[PDB]
Amino acid sequence: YIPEPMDLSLVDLPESLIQLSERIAENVHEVWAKARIDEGWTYGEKRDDIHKKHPCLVPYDELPEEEKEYDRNTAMNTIKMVKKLGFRIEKEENKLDYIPEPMDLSLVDLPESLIQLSERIAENVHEVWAKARIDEGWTYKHPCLVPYDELPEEEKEYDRNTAMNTIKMVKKLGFRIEKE
């Protein structure tokens, strides 16, 4: 099995999609902070995994720039995937006082075309994961290094709901995704 992820190296994002990419990365930080603060986590300068302290539990603007890169690139890469498949994307606080306010996607409905788009994203994301690690000498050592088709529906439901949630964030942020 040789994973072949989509080549995004030639797609170029205009300013409106760069900004969309950054508001997505911002919202996934808030989702993460609400999730863990409700789990009983708090800010501390160094991170303790058993006393539930962590330093990124901060307003997004007070995160270090390196600390923002991972989500920004992931969000940007998903937008590029959507672009390379031929989809248009068009329209239409103090540290101690920080309460994360993630978007609510509970009621965002996705048409069937975008649900399958989400599935296509999840497949390629799994493909990027495999190649990266298969390039570093891994082998089936992980049992997820399989064709996306031959993954167990337990894990395939996870990747697909992650991509589905990004597509919902785009729609709640006022954008429209249409083929051609």
From TrEMBL:
- List the keywords (alphabetical): Metal-binding, Receptor
Keyword tRNA processing applies: no
Binding of Mg(2+) occurs at D49
GO annotation terms (biological process): calcium ion transport
Show the GO MF annotations. Answer: metal ion binding
State the superkingdom.
Bacteria
What Pfam families does the annotation carry?
A: RyR (PF02026)
Occurrences of domain Ryanodine receptor Ryr (ranges): 1-179
Specify the protein name: Ryanodine receptor
Q: Which organism is it from?
A: Bacteroides thetaiotaomicron (strain ATCC 29148 / DSM 2079 / JCM 5827 / CCUG 10774 / NCTC 10582 / VPI-5482 / E50)
